[PDB]
Amino acid sequence: KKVVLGKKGDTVELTCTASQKKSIQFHWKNSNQIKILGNQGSFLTKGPSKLNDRADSRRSLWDQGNFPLIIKNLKIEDSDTYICEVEDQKEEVQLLV
Amino acid sequence: NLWVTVYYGVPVWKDAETTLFCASDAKAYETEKHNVWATHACVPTDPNPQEIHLENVTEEFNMWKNNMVEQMHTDIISLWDQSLKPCVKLTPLCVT
Amino acid sequence: LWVTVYYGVPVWKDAETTLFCASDAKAYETEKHNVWATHACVPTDPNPQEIHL
Amino acid sequence: VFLGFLGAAGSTMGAASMTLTVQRAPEAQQHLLKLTVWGIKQLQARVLAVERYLRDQQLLGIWGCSGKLICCTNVPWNSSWSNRNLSEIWDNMTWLQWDKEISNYTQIIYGLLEESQNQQEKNE
Amino acid sequence: AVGIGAVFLGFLGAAGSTMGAASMTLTVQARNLLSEAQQHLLKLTVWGIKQLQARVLAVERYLRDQQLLGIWGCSGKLICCTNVPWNSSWSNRNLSEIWDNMTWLQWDKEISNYTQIIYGLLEESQNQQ
Amino acid sequence: GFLGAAGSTMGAASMTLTVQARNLEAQQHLLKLTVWGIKQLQARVLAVERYLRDQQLLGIWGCSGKLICCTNVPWNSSWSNRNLSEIWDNMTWLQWDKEISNYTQIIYGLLEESQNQQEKNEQDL
Amino acid sequence: LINCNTSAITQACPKVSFEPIPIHYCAPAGFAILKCKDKKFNGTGPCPSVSTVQCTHGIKPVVSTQLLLNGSLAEEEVMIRSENITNNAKNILVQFNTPVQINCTRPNDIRQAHCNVSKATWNETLGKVVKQLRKHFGNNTIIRFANSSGGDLEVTTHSFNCGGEFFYCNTSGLFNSTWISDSITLPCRIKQIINMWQRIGQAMYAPPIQGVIRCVSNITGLILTRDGGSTTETFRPGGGDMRDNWRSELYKYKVVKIEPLGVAPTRCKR
Numbered sequence: 001k002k003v004v005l006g007k008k009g010d011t012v013e014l015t016c017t018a019s020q021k022k023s024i025q026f027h028w029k030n031s032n033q034i035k036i037l038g039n040q041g042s043f044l045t046k047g048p049s050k051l052n053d054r055a056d057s058r059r060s061l062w063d064q065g066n067f068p069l070i071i072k073n074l075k076i077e078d079s080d081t082y083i084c085e086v087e088d089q090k091e092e093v094q095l096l097v
Numbered sequence: 098n099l100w101v102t103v104y105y106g107v108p109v110w111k112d113a114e115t116t117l118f119c120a121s122d123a124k125a126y127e128t129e130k131h132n133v134w135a136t137h138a139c140v141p142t143d144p145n146p147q148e149i150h151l152e153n154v155t156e157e158f159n160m161w162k163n164n165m166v167e168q169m170h171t172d173i174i175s176l177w178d179q180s181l182k183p184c185v186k187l188t189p190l191c192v193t
Numbered sequence: 194l195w196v197t198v199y200y201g202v203p204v205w206k207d208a209e210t211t212l213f214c215a216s217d218a219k220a221y222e223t224e225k226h227n228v229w230a231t232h233a234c235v236p237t238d239p240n241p242q243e244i245h246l
Numbered sequence: 247v248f249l250g251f252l253g254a255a256g257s258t259m260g261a262a263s264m265t266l267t268v269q270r271a272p273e274a275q276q277h278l279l280k281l282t283v284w285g286i287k288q289l290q291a292r293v294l295a296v297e298r299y300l301r302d303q304q305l306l307g308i309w310g311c312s313g314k315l316i317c318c319t320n321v322p323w324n325s326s327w328s329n330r331n332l333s334e335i336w337d338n339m340t341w342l343q344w345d346k347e348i349s350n351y352t353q354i355i356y357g358l359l360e361e362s363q364n365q366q367e368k369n370e
Numbered sequence: 371a372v373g374i375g376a377v378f379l380g381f382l383g384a385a386g387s388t389m390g391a392a393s394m395t396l397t398v399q400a401r402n403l404l405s406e407a408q409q410h411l412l413k414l415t416v417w418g419i420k421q422l423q424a425r426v427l428a429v430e431r432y433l434r435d436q437q438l439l440g441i442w443g444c445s446g447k448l449i450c451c452t453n454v455p456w457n458s459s460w461s462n463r464n465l466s467e468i469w470d471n472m473t474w475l476q477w478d479k480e481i482s483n484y485t486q487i488i489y490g491l492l493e494e495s496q497n498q499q
Numbered sequence: 500g501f502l503g504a505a506g507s508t509m510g511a512a513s514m515t516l517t518v519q520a521r522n523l524e525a526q527q528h529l530l531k532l533t534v535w536g537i538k539q540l541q542a543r544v545l546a547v548e549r550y551l552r553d554q555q556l557l558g559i560w561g562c563s564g565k566l567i568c569c570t571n572v573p574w575n576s577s578w579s580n581r582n583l584s585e586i587w588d589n590m591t592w593l594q595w596d597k598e599i600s601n602y603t604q605i606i607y608g609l610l611e612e613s614q615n616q617q618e619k620n621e622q623d624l
Numbered sequence: 625l626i627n628c629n630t631s632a633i634t635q636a637c638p639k640v641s642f643e644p645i646p647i648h649y650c651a652p653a654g655f656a657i658l659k660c661k662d663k664k665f666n667g668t669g670p671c672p673s674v675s676t677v678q679c680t681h682g683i684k685p686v687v688s689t690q691l692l693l694n695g696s697l698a699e700e701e702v703m704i705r706s707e708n709i710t711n712n713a714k715n716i717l718v719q720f721n722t723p724v725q726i727n728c729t730r731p732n733d734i735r736q737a738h739c740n741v742s743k744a745t746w747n748e749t750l751g752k753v754v755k756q757l758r759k760h761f762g763n764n765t766i767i768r769f770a771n772s773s774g775g776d777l778e779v780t781t782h783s784f785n786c787g788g789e790f791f792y793c794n795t796s797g798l799f800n801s802t803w804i805s806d807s808i809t810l811p812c813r814i815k816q817i818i819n820m821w822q823r824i825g826q827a828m829y830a831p832p833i834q835g836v837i838r839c840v841s842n843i844t845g846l847i848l849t850r851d852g853g854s855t856t857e858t859f860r861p862g863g864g865d866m867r868d869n870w871r872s873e874l875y876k877y878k879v880v881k882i883e884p885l886g887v888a889p890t891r892c893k894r
């Protein structure tokens with residue numbers, strides 16, 4: 001199980017990784033299963049969480065398989081684990097500030 | 098004692114993944130920009146279509162692993178790319 | 194004697210089909226036949242064939 | 247299989263059954279459109295002439311004698327079906343005159359001729 | 371595909387019926403199932419070719435079955451019997467358990483483990499004979 | 500449509516002779532594709548009608564449907580009687596086709612009559 | 625360790641008329657399209673009334689987000705389809721058994737468009753969905769329709785097309801209620817720098833035409849999305865993966881291959 005650390009306010013890079021690099025629809029959820037990001041075709045769709053305007057992904061990297069989650073302005077409340085859903089691979093990554 | 102027969106015309110089917118077309122009802126004089134595309138990649142329709150109801154048969158359908166959708170998502174991407182031609186695109190490359 | 198069956202026999206009965214019309218036209222003259230004879234017609238037959246029976 | 251295939255409707259049915267088995271600028275920049283459009287008319291006629299052959303090989307298959315020209319069967323004639331003397335309807339009569347005679351019974355011959363194969367399908 | 375494309379749909383008419391009542395009507399159905407302006411003409415011809423690039427495809431798909439029936443002896447016969455003995459290792463079911471309480475689809479879920487072996491045995495049995 | 504596969508051996512042909520049927524956006528040039536769409540489709544109806552006109556010959560000689568059929572017309576000695584061993588060993592089907600020139604026209608003439616003799620034999624029992 | 629360049633292709637761009645037509649989907653000889661005539665079809669599982677036909681009905685490729693314009697209507701009741709309800713990441717398709725007509729026009733600021741939809745026909749038709757939603761959700765929970773949550777402008781607003789002009793309608797005054805046990809206007813803004821739904825990458829178009837722009841359509845669909853928390857359920861709409869637009873019209877079709885060559889044992893001979 002992977003883990004990452006931040007201080008405060010910075011930008012992290014929590015990455016999923018697919019197997020074929022052809023833009024499979026992914027997601028990102030917290031421990032309580034609230035949506036964070038997610039592909040919708042070729043658009044982007046955030047979820048009704050506390051990170052509703054402080055999260056992003058690099059749109060050019062979705063064609064190369066990697067679906068990063070970039071969280072700007074790390075507060076103290078977002079210390080959690082975060083779970084991809086690419087096809088079935090719930091790749092969990094825990095973050096602490 | 099019992100011997101193998103052969104029959105031709107038995108109601109059997111499998112689950113294949115062929116490449117179907119569109120065959121819409123285009124007019125071939127319009128410039129609706131669908132009728133420009135549907136006159137080239139789609140044949141005329143059939144005016145007396147065939148529809149055979151069946152007996153007591155329960156087919157196990159599916160809706161979320163259907164593969165007619167990937168042959169509609171291609172022919173509409175290949176519609177809009179020749180219909181709504183833009184002025185400036187910005188498509189990334191990102192070579193390794 | 195007995196019923197026998199032949200294939201390829203030279204017989205024809207009769208018909209009541211819908212014939213299609215040819216009428217070689219010009220397609221740019223504003224005469225009213227030459228604007229009709231491109232609406233519901235076809236180019237006329239190149240190299241027609243006619244057999245005597 | 248063709249459509250102009252038998253335009254040899256002669257006189258003798260005995261001779262017809264013999265040959266039953268033996269079978270420059272007109273353009274004006276539009277001569278590639280005359281040969282393309284009427285190319286389709288010579289293809290919609292040939293393909294339908296194939297599908298008439300395959301529609302009839304299934305009908306000769308129900309009578310058992312498929313893929314063969316002269317089909318000899320196991321059902322006799324009658325008296326209602328123009329009971330001639332096998333000389334007036336085989337050496338001096340054209341097929342069109344013979345087809346016009348038994349046209350009242352061609353739909354009646356075809357019913358029992360199907361049944362004569364189903365009886366030969368019972369001994370199997 | 372108006373010629374021999376409507377024939378292949380008519381094969382699936384009696385699906386889900388029992389195996390005896392579906393094989394009994396094969397002879398019956400096959401006799402019945404086998405029954406321009408300036409800008410227009412260079413587009414109305416591609417509508418005449420593409421309606422013949424599939425109608426011919428209904429012909430050479432139908433003749434790729436009679437080339438297959440003709441290898442196994444009988445060509446042109448719908449119901450046809452062959453000199454190859456039915457092994458009980460395909461299915462261990464009596465004929466009372468087969469032509470009375472089964473539909474044709476259940477055979478593809480039963481003998482398709484063996485259905486390429488039967489096609490080889492039907493080859494040699496009308497090859498040397 | 501039934502073509503060949505490279506020839507190159509008479510004996511290895513007859514093993515693979517069966518398997519050829521035993522198992523299986525432009526919008527700018529509308530004359531380059533419409534003329535060559537007919538000529539590539541006139542060559543697919545001819546490949547069907549040459550098959551039906553050649554199952555008609557094998558229907559005459561009783562060989563209809565069978566790829567490798569066997570018939571009762573014996574070898575004359577005057578049809579280039581070579582060694583029957585090495586014909587199947589090291590020879591192509593092209594090289595055998597040169598080995599009979601005008602006997603093919605008279606081989607076919609017996610098969611039309613031998614079936615008609617067999618037509619006058621099966622109906623004379 | 626990677627970096628990405630962004631190209632810039634430049635075609636010749638006129639103002640092309642653009643309305644969708646019904647496009648069937650037929651197959652070649654040797655195949656067949658089965659068709660589920662069950663008027664209560666969940667989407668998956670065994671359909672009992674299977675028919676057999678060549679192609680489907682004239683499916684109009686109407687690209688939209690947050691709604692499904694000009695589609696086809698259910699037979700009896702509002703259907704609700706998903707690959708796995710309570711997965712929280714699967715888009716709940718919803719069909720309608722009635723058309724909710726929507727007048728959405730640009731009158732004679734050139735990028736300004738109101739969008740009239742009746743509050744009578746919408747409050748009924750949004751009420752029928754709450755019946756069919758409590759069937760899967762316990763018959764005692766509160767159902768709350770929020771507006772959206774973040775993302776691009778194409779998925780957070782009812783983005784569609786109308787005569788070549790890419791409308792962007794704000795539907796916050798369409799899903800706003802909270803359910804317990806005359807005509808709305810929507811501020812659409814025609815845009816010129818949009819995202820593409822085909823691939824990833826922006827597109828920049830011509831300025832809009834002069835004159836009136838009108839398109840009267842039937843809202844015959846929805847793409848909602850739950851927000852499973854930790855009690856009431858918050859159903860905010862969504863969309864964007866355009867396969868889900870056409871999944872809701874190819875939903876009762878399957879492509880099979882006819883294999884008419886049977887080998888059964890009998891007691892024949894020769």
Ligand SMILES: *[C@@H]1O[C@H](CO)[C@@H](O[C@@H]2O[C@H](CO)[C@@H](O[C@@H]3O[C@H](CO)[C@@H](O)[C@H](O[C@H]4O[C@H](CO)[C@@H](O)[C@H](O)[C@@H]4O[C@H]4O[C@H](CO)[C@@H](O)[C@H](O)[C@@H]4O)[C@@H]3O)[C@H](O)[C@H]2NC(C)=O)[C@H](O)[C@H]1NC(C)=O
Binds near residue numbers: 693784788
């Ligand atoms: C759901 O289905 C409905 C039903 O079809 C769709 O509604 C249709 O929408 C189209 C356009 O979106 C509309 O077509 C217009 O009809 C007018 C009435 O005849 C036409 O006059 C108009 O043509 C003009 O506009 C085009 C736009 O580019 C021009 O290309 C065209 O040449 C005409 O342009 C003249 O007028 C304009 C000003 O409008 C001016 O700028 C030009 O210089 C020129 O003078 C359109 O063809 C249909 O009428 C609508 N259907 C109905 C029944 O009303 C709806 O779009 C669908 N929903 C979705 C999301 O697609």
Ligand SMILES: *[C@@H]1O[C@H](CO)[C@@H](O[C@@H]2O[C@H](CO)[C@@H](O)[C@H](O)[C@H]2NC(C)=O)[C@H](O)[C@H]1NC(C)=O
Binds near residue numbers: 708709710711712
């Ligand atoms: C639908 O999706 C949900 C959410 O992913 C699945 O429910 C959870 O599945 C995980 C498997 O990793 C279990 O550990 C949880 O206990 C499940 N939770 C609940 C509340 O069921 C569910 O299995 C999916 N349904 C189907 C049919 O696949």
Ligand SMILES: *[C@@H]1O[C@H](CO)[C@@H](O[C@@H]2O[C@H](CO)[C@@H](O)[C@H](O)[C@H]2NC(C)=O)[C@H](O)[C@H]1NC(C)=O
Binds near residue numbers: 794795797
């Ligand atoms: C879409 O419309 C809604 C309202 O219909 C906008 O949301 C807020 O609405 C209230 C009044 O209802 C305003 O006072 C606020 O200024 C609006 N905005 C916010 C951020 O609260 C919403 O902003 C509209 N969407 C867009 C993209 O403009």
Ligand SMILES: *[C@@H]1O[C@H](CO)[C@@H](O)[C@H](O)[C@H]1NC(C)=O
Binds near residue numbers: 152153386387388
């Ligand atoms: C459907 O099932 C019933 C129940 O046995 C049966 O009687 C009927 O014949 C079946 N339908 C058909 C068309 O065979």
Ligand SMILES: *[C@@H]1O[C@H](CO)[C@@H](O)[C@H](O)[C@H]1NC(C)=O
Binds near residue numbers: 255258
């Ligand atoms: C035509 O009739 C004449 C006179 O009866 C006859 O000699 C000739 O053989 C016939 N030819 C054909 C082709 O029927």
Ligand SMILES: *[C@@H]1O[C@H](CO)[C@@H](O)[C@H](O)[C@H]1NC(C)=O
Binds near residue numbers: 666668670706707708
């Ligand atoms: C849909 O309904 C069928 C019953 O018709 C059921 O078997 C299946 O599990 C349901 N699927 C979902 C996703 O609810």
Ligand SMILES: *[C@@H]1O[C@H](CO)[C@@H](O)[C@H](O)[C@H]1NC(C)=O
Binds near residue numbers: 748
């Ligand atoms: C909508 O309908 C519900 C019940 O039918 C009602 O409670 C509510 O007041 C209605 N709202 C409006 C705006 O009419």
Ligand SMILES: *[C@@H]1O[C@H](CO)[C@@H](O)[C@H](O)[C@H]1NC(C)=O
Binds near residue numbers: 762763764
């Ligand atoms: C919801 O309503 C249906 C029909 O009205 C009923 O069958 C079901 O039991 C109800 N659910 C409950 C009470 O949880």
Ligand SMILES: *[C@@H]1O[C@H](CO)[C@@H](O)[C@H](O)[C@H]1NC(C)=O
Binds near residue numbers: 773794
């Ligand atoms: C949703 O509604 C809230 C409050 O009404 C508003 O602040 C927000 O901007 C709205 N978002 C959208 C996308 O309409």
Ligand SMILES: *[C@@H]1O[C@H](CO)[C@@H](O)[C@H](O)[C@H]1NC(C)=O
Binds near residue numbers: 840842
């Ligand atoms: C809306 O639905 C009606 C029937 O309910 C139909 O007649 C009309 O054409 C539809 N409008 C469209 C498709 O734009």
